[PDB]
Design a protein around this motif. Structure first.
Motif, mmCIF file in Angstrom:
data_model
loop_
_atom_site.group_PDB
_atom_site.id
_atom_site.type_symbol
_atom_site.label_atom_id
_atom_site.label_comp_id
_atom_site.label_asym_id
_atom_site.label_seq_id
_atom_site.Cartn_x
_atom_site.Cartn_y
_atom_site.Cartn_z
ATOM 1 N N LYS A 9 1.007 -1.234 -0.075
ATOM 2 C CA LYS A 9 -0.031 0.141 -0.010
ATOM 3 C C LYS A 9 1.009 1.323 0.054
ATOM 4 N N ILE A 10 0.881 1.948 -1.256
ATOM 5 C CA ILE A 10 1.666 3.088 -1.422
ATOM 6 C C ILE A 10 1.478 4.077 -0.381
ATOM 7 N N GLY A 11 0.490 4.676 -0.431
ATOM 8 C CA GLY A 11 0.115 5.903 0.651
ATOM 9 C C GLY A 11 -1.533 6.093 0.379
ATOM 10 N N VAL A 17 -6.432 5.925 -1.996
ATOM 11 C CA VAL A 17 -5.501 5.026 -1.719
ATOM 12 C C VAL A 17 -4.656 4.688 -2.941
ATOM 13 N N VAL A 18 -3.243 4.826 -2.537
ATOM 14 C CA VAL A 18 -2.199 4.437 -3.828
ATOM 15 C C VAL A 18 -1.448 3.026 -3.491
ATOM 16 N N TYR A 19 -1.380 2.409 -4.540
ATOM 17 C CA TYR A 19 -0.743 0.950 -4.339
ATOM 18 C C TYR A 19 0.227 0.978 -5.309
ATOM 19 N N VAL A 30 3.736 -0.645 -11.428
ATOM 20 C CA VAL A 30 2.986 0.601 -11.491
ATOM 21 C C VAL A 30 2.354 1.249 -10.273
ATOM 22 N N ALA A 31 1.684 2.234 -10.315
ATOM 23 C CA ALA A 31 1.186 2.858 -9.113
ATOM 24 C C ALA A 31 -0.232 3.008 -9.292
ATOM 25 N N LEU A 32 -1.065 2.168 -8.534
ATOM 26 C CA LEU A 32 -2.296 2.124 -8.635
ATOM 27 C C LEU A 32 -3.192 2.832 -7.610
ATOM 28 N N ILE A 59 5.937 15.282 -15.522
ATOM 29 C CA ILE A 59 4.409 14.857 -15.136
ATOM 30 C C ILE A 59 4.481 13.368 -15.092
ATOM 31 N N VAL A 60 4.149 12.708 -13.924
ATOM 32 C CA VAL A 60 3.912 11.450 -13.987
ATOM 33 C C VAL A 60 2.891 11.100 -15.090
ATOM 34 N N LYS A 61 3.358 10.011 -15.684
ATOM 35 C CA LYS A 61 2.292 9.630 -16.848
ATOM 36 C C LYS A 61 1.286 8.731 -16.406
ATOM 37 N N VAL A 75 -3.984 4.155 -13.264
ATOM 38 C CA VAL A 75 -2.703 3.462 -13.280
ATOM 39 C C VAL A 75 -1.722 4.559 -13.985
ATOM 40 N N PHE A 76 -0.850 4.817 -12.855
ATOM 41 C CA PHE A 76 0.221 5.566 -13.182
ATOM 42 C C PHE A 76 1.586 4.927 -13.241
ATOM 43 N N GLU A 77 2.627 5.643 -14.107
ATOM 44 C CA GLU A 77 3.955 5.049 -14.081
ATOM 45 C C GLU A 77 4.305 5.217 -12.615
ATOM 46 N N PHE A 78 5.161 4.036 -12.018
ATOM 47 C CA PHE A 78 5.667 4.189 -10.893
ATOM 48 C C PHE A 78 7.112 4.878 -10.704
ATOM 49 N N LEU A 79 7.156 5.840 -9.553
ATOM 50 C CA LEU A 79 8.520 6.339 -9.187
ATOM 51 C C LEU A 79 8.759 5.958 -7.833
ATOM 52 N N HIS A 80 9.776 5.663 -7.247
ATOM 53 C CA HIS A 80 10.203 5.296 -5.971
ATOM 54 C C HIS A 80 10.100 5.993 -4.570
ATOM 55 N N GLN A 81 10.030 7.164 -4.990
ATOM 56 C CA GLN A 81 9.917 8.036 -3.747
ATOM 57 C C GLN A 81 9.123 9.346 -3.769
ATOM 58 N N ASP A 82 8.613 9.781 -2.654
ATOM 59 C CA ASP A 82 7.966 11.052 -2.876
ATOM 60 C C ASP A 82 8.791 12.010 -2.171
ATOM 61 N N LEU A 83 8.563 13.313 -2.630
ATOM 62 C CA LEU A 83 9.383 14.401 -1.924
ATOM 63 C C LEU A 83 9.312 14.559 -0.534
ATOM 64 N N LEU A 129 4.620 14.813 -5.103
ATOM 65 C CA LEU A 129 5.940 15.148 -5.994
ATOM 66 C C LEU A 129 6.942 13.807 -5.914
ATOM 67 N N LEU A 130 7.163 13.414 -7.141
ATOM 68 C CA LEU A 130 8.071 12.164 -7.213
ATOM 69 C C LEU A 130 9.174 12.092 -7.739
ATOM 70 N N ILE A 131 10.241 11.433 -7.086
ATOM 71 C CA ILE A 131 11.494 11.806 -7.570
ATOM 72 C C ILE A 131 12.187 10.226 -7.971
ATOM 73 N N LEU A 139 5.425 15.856 -11.238
ATOM 74 C CA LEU A 139 4.194 15.983 -10.540
ATOM 75 C C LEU A 139 3.081 15.019 -10.864
ATOM 76 N N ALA A 140 2.367 14.448 -9.822
ATOM 77 C CA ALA A 140 1.581 13.457 -9.959
ATOM 78 C C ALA A 140 0.002 13.840 -9.532
ATOM 79 N N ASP A 141 -1.080 13.511 -10.085
ATOM 80 C CA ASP A 141 -2.335 13.862 -9.607
ATOM 81 C C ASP A 141 -2.947 15.218 -10.424
ATOM 82 N N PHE A 142 -2.468 15.507 -11.514
ATOM 83 C CA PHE A 142 -2.744 16.853 -12.323
ATOM 84 C C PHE A 142 -4.165 16.670 -12.661
HETATM 85 N N1 LIG Z 1 3.489 8.071 -2.025
HETATM 86 C C1 LIG Z 1 3.925 7.755 -3.148
HETATM 87 N N2 LIG Z 1 5.224 7.096 -3.040
HETATM 88 C C2 LIG Z 1 5.590 6.401 -3.981
HETATM 89 N N3 LIG Z 1 6.776 5.632 -4.038
HETATM 90 N N4 LIG Z 1 4.794 6.606 -5.253
HETATM 91 C C3 LIG Z 1 3.804 7.198 -5.500
HETATM 92 C C4 LIG Z 1 2.982 7.511 -6.682
HETATM 93 C C5 LIG Z 1 1.866 8.128 -6.706
HETATM 94 C C6 LIG Z 1 1.167 8.508 -7.884
HETATM 95 F F1 LIG Z 1 0.137 9.168 -7.906
HETATM 96 C C7 LIG Z 1 1.614 7.949 -8.921
HETATM 97 C C8 LIG Z 1 2.930 7.368 -9.060
HETATM 98 C C9 LIG Z 1 3.689 6.900 -7.837
HETATM 99 O O1 LIG Z 1 4.770 6.414 -7.887
HETATM 100 N N5 LIG Z 1 3.222 7.846 -4.062
#
Ligand SMILES: Nc1nc(N)nc(-c2cc(F)ccc2O)n1
Length: 294
Positions: A9-11, A17-19, A30-32, A59-61, A75-83, A129-131, A139-142
């Motif tokens: 569970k991402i956050g 909720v993001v997974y 991916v991030a769901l 922009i997060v795809k 469904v978004f491309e996944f990035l490993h860490q938020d700001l 904001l994801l890095i 930027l995510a959730d635009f």
């Molecule tokens: N908290 C957190 N942490 C992480 N690692 N990712 C994401 C994430 C969120 C989105 F909306 C789209 C893609 C993502 O990767 N969120």
């Protein structure tokens, strides 16, 4: 979800909720996001669906929009860490100025792109904001905010953060402009620099008054029309504006000047993302590699 496998569970954001998940069949990670409910506007799915066409390096795809069993999945491309996590991890030493500058420059490029396409974020914050390891920030959730509304909280009893909300929103303005995103980003810029939230309000009025205590209670001089805003009250205390060098020390004058333009009260005076990209603060911008511990 049958097509995936909740890795973790991402956050939890204001809209859902993001997974982190892997597409069992394609193996793509991916991030769901699950959107919370028997109505589900069809005008929103169209709106959101259009966002899939937004493509920019900052922009997060958005890969897909799925409507099923009342539930909506993005469904978004996944990035490993938020700001937010990175700032917390960097609290002891602080994010190096060159990286702060690089991230700010990149985020403005992202906003400049979205805004030119008439897409606003409306709820920017460190968690959105994801890095990645290569020094990019996205930027995510635009545009979700527009296609949607604004729940009392998030979806299931959770304290929504007001720290990055523009004053015009707090004062009840019915129409938002791209300026609301510049304000949020200015608040985030200050936070990267000082390592403390700029305006950590715990209620809407505390948020507003924290802004007033720092930038001065707005009046018709600096903000024409402010006394006619829906929630403006003549009874607001009148605080004097604070010397700006006390707000974000030890940021240099180029940085303070840019921040001051991102935090102007009047949305019409607030600097645009495109104009900000031309500010002298970015004359020596580079793209450093962050020290990311995943
Ligand atoms: N908290 C957190 N942490 C992480 N690692 N990712 C994401 C994430 C969120 C989105 F909306 C789209 C893609 C993502 O990767 N969120």
């Amino acid at each position: 979800m049958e097509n995936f496998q909740k890795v973790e569970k991402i956050g939890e954001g204001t809209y859902g909720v993001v997974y982190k998940a892997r597409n069992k069949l394609t193996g793509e990670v991916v991030a769901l996001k699950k959107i919370r409910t028997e109505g589900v506007p069809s005008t929103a799915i169209r709106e959101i669906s259009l966002l899939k066409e937004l493509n920019h390096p900052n922009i997060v795809k958005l890969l897909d929009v799925i409507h099923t069993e009342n539930k909506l999945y993005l469904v978004f491309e996944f990035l490993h860490q938020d700001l937010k996590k990175f700032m917390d991890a960097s609290a002891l030493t602080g994010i190096p100025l060159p990286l702060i500058k690089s991230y700010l420059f990149q985020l403005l490029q992202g906003l400049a792109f979205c805004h030119s396409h008439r897409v606003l974020h409306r709820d920017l914050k460190p968690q959105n904001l994801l890095i990645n390891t290569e020094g990019a920030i996205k930027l995510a959730d635009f545009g979700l905010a527009r296609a949607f509304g604004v729940p009392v909280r998030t979806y299931t009893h959770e304290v929504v953060t007001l720290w990055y909300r523009a004053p015009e929103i707090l004062l009840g303005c019915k129409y938002y402009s791209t300026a609301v995103d510049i304000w949020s980003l200015g608040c985030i810029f200050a936070e990267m620099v000082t390592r403390r939230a700029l305006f950590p309000g715990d209620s809407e009025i505390d948020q507003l008054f924290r802004i007033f205590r720092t930038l001065g209670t707005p009046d018709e001089v600096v903000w024409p029309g402010v006394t006619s805003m829906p929630d403006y009250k003549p009874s607001f205390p009148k605080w004097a504006r604070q010397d700006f060098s006390k707000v974000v020390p030890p940021l240099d004058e180029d940085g303070r000047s840019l921040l001051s333009q991102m935090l102007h009260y009047d949305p019409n005076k607030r600097i645009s993302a495109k104009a900000a990209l031309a500010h002298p603060f970015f004359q020596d911008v580079t793209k450093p590699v962050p020290h990311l511990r995943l």
